[PDB]
Paper text:
The 90 kDa heat-shock protein (Hsp90) is an abundant, essential cellular protein family present in all eukaryotes that is the hub of a molecular chaperone machine which utilizes a reaction cycle driven by ATP hydrolysis to stabilize, regulate and activate the function of several hundred important client proteins under both normal and stress conditions. All of the Hsp90 homologues exist as flexible homodimers, with each protomer consisting of three domains: an N-terminal domain (NTD), a middle domain (MD) and a C-terminal domain (CTD). The NTD contains an ATP-binding site, while the MD also participates in ATP hydrolysis by contributing a conserved arginine (Arg400 in human Hsp90α) from the ‘catalytic loop’ to stabilize the γ-phosphate of ATP. The CTD is involved in homodimerization.
In this study, we report the crystal structure of human Hsp90α MD and CTD (Hsp90αMC) labeled with a coumarin derivative, MDCC {7-diethylamino-3-[N-(2-maleimidoethyl)carbamoyl]coumarin}, which is covalently linked to Cys374 of Hsp90α. The MDCC–Hsp90αMC structure was determined at 3.5 Å resolution. Unexpectedly, we observed MDCC to only be covalently linked to Cys374 in the MD, although there are six additional cysteines in Hsp90αMC (Cys420, Cys481, Cys529, Cys572, Cys597 and Cys598). The MDCC–Hsp90αMC structure contains three molecules in the asymmetric unit, which further form a hexamer through crystallographic symmetry. Each of the MDCC molecules is located inside a composite hydrophobic pocket at the hexamer interface, contacting Hsp90αMC mainly through hydrophobic interactions. The binding of MDCC induced the ordering of three regions in Hsp90, including the catalytic loop, the Src loop and a CTD loop, which adopt unique conformations and contribute to Hsp90 hexamer association. The structure suggests that MDCC binding locks Hsp90 into an inactive hexamer, with one key residue Arg400 oriented away from the ATP-binding pocket so that the stabilization of the NTD and MD that is required for optimal ATP hydrolysis is not possible. Our data suggest that the binding of MC inhibitors to Hsp90αMC stabilizes Hsp90 in its hexameric state, switching the equilibrium away from the dimeric state.
Author numbering:
A (entry chain A): 293 to 627, 630 to 699
B (entry chain B): 293 to 350, 356 to 625, 631 to 698
Write the structure that this text describes.
């Protein structure tokens, strides 16, 4: 009688859909979700789409399967891999597309097919984003989905600038407040204190490393929520996600960390600015060019120091990923400028300011400046120049802790 | 009027060779080296082989054009040459092999197996020739060092002839690369082992902790900085009788001393108390804690089990496991003659529940992992521990 995608959506049982999706992809378990829609107008076409349970494989990047949408015209099969029928970041969708009107045999000149496809393209991506917007309403079944295709969503953020807002509403992250849960961007905004003009994120490799890192200290004490961006995609994602609902994004690993001045803590921070600037310009010289600037931390509580990164430059996470990639492709590392922030109110920083402003030539002072700098790189997610150099330096500091002999 | 490979070699100008290799591979510069040979016997066939100057970017198993009685057949010939020689370009003109076969007539594979084994011999002949001019072999090993080490891994029958062609940086060779036969000439007749280290840069392995008592003892250590080496040594057991030992692995055998081992034995039992304590302070963070016989300036180091993943291995594999996202044995050696070990034995045997002792054992263990090429559990945890130790260096 009629093919399965011509019967209309609410007249089909979810198991009938599944038997079809199994027969279409040989997947051993049924579909996860289904969107099934038709279109009339200048163009008549139907479309049945499936989202597999287990995220498909990355396919050699061969790009030899831009998609797996079986393509029909007037109920006859045509192609299996239709390059411009679906944007690359939705290639996991399985299903069929049955057009009534598109032109098949075409030369270069007949761009009309490429118009019909572009409109079907936008209509297919629209009905998908609709389905994901639908899925986001049941919080704990959307979990089975974002678990598999989070990497896919973030890719769209980078490529499809036209749908960037609708896509960003679908992102979920770990934050400081959501101790064990993932939360939307709209939720983080509902918990913002007014006059906070920024959304705080940190990029590392594990939650425990970014949660207990040095960079977030005076931000968690300040009652602020910070977003944990742990997957390597995130480093590229934020590069094109400028703002959400008006508020701009800021990295807690970068210099110039803006915070709300209350009862002009800038006046106390300014006294610290000038009080320790002596110590600032000394360690800049003890280190020479291993660092670019030495400034007073406005973000450090329990740790004495941290290594922050240039504003318009690579980060510790990026520097790790890129150079972990340059192992794979045999290459010189080629051509990341760091800033070191010191906590004025820490005893090690206070006591160091005394020994240094008394005798800045003391080889013990030089040794301690280098040592704190090296451990700060460890805190900030970097790799050391020469590990045994730091090792011998720690051994010397241990010699000082107990009997020097 | 006659094809170029059937013409007798030494009647061939190197420009004719180069012009031909250009016409065969469109390479803009001439060949690097050429081996050209014929064979008679049960099988008659000729072969002209080229080594390109620039190492190519390697599913085309090789580019050896294959002729029979001077007629072309195919170029991608899978079982004509082992995979680690895919950079060879050239032609092979057989007189007798059978092309059309029923799967039963594997006799087609015998003729190929014979040409295969015969081709690899004439190549290793060429490479042994190249090893004689030191600073031109460098132009080659610079490009194909990776290839030779792969052959060590795969071709066990030619494993010996290949190792003779390996070149490395060592402690003695400050800037030059040296053969294995040379390292044997500098061995003491009481030395039964060849010492190597696996790292990432020459500068890091030369100043490493594992080699301390080896440069003081007048011993030479081989610097393996390329990642292939990690797999190379897994199949490179011995050269010229003397076996290889990794300075990152446990059970470091050394030339037995003038019965001074009794002093190493007194150190063994004297610090064994501290060994039992640090073993428990680090709850399964390490597998065993024993007395070092290899450390001079460093107080402690982390070696790996003989059969386990090397320190190098765990770094590379987990650096690659960023691709899969798949996310996946240690020994702690302490230096007896170091003051920090003596002082720790005293603080431990006086009050072994001192949190300063706990702070010191954990701190020493973590920095030793850094010394040994590992990654830290929680960097901010180690940092807070150092900040605590620095706070102790001066008043709290
Ligand atoms: C119908 C016979 N031939 C020529 C061999 C085909 C078959 C398929 C296609 C697909 C094309 C094409 O549009 N590619 C880009 C997007 N795309 C579609 O819109 C459908 C399939 C597909 O890959 C095309 O331009 O010519 C084609 C020509
Ligand atoms: C021209 C006829 N065609 C190919 C279309 C051939 C040509 C060559 C071969 C070689 C075979 C063969 O002997 N393979 C074993 C070794 N071998 C070669 O000698 C060349 C490639 C290769 O794998 C074969 O099984 O079928 C062939 C079929």
């Amino acid at each position: 009688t009629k093919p399965i995608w011509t019967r209309n959506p609410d007249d089909i049982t979810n198991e009938e859909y599944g038997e079809f999706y199994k027969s279409l992809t040989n997947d051993w378990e049924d579909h996860l979700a289904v969107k099934h829609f038709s279109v009339e107008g200048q163009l008549e076409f139907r479309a049945l789409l499936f989202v597999p349970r287990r995220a498909p494989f990355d396919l050699f990047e061969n790009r030899k399967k831009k998609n797996n949408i079986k393509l029909y015209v007037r109920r006859v099969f045509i192609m299996d891999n239709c390059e411009e029928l679906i944007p690359e970041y939705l290639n996991f969708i399985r299903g069929v597309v049955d057009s009534e009107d598109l032109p098949l045999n075409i030369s270069r000149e007949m761009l009309q097919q490429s118009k019909i496809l572009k409109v079907i393209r936008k209509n297919l991506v629209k009905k998908c984003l609709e389905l994901f917007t639908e899925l986001a309403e049941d919080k704990e079944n959307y979990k089975k989905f974002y678990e598999q295709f989070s990497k896919n969503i973030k890719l769209g953020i980078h490529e499809d600038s036209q749908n960037r807002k609708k896509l960003s509403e679908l992102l979920r992250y770990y934050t400081s407040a959501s101790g064990d849960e993932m939360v939307s961007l709209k939720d983080y905004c509902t918990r913002m204190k007014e006059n906070q003009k920024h959304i705080y994120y940190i990029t590392g490799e594990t939650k425990d490393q970014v949660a207990n890192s040095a960079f977030v200290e005076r931000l968690r004490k300040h009652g602020l929520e910070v977003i944990y961006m742990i997957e390597p995609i995130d480093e590229y994602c934020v590069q094109q996600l400028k703002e959400f609902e008006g508020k701009t994004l800021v990295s807690v690993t970068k210099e110039g960390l803006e915070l709300p001045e209350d009862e002009e803590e800038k006046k106390k921070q300014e006294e610290k600015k000038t009080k320790f600037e002596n110590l600032c310009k000394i360690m800049k010289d003890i280190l020479e060019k291993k660092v670019e600037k030495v400034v007073v931390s406005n973000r450090l509580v329990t740790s004495p120091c941290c290594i922050v990164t240039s504003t318009y430059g690579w980060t510790a996470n990026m520097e790790r990923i890129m150079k972990a990639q340059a192992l794979r492709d045999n290459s010189t590392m080629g051509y990341a400028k760091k800033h070191l922030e010191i906590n004025p109110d820490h005893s090690i920083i206070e006591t160091l300011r005394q020994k240094a402003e008394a005798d800045k030539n003391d080889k013990s002072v030089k040794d301690l400046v280098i040592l704190l700098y090296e451990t700060a790189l460890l805190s900030s997610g970097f790799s050391l120049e020469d590990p045994q150099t730091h090792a011998n330096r720690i051994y010397r500091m241990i010699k000082l802790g107990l009997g020097i002999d």
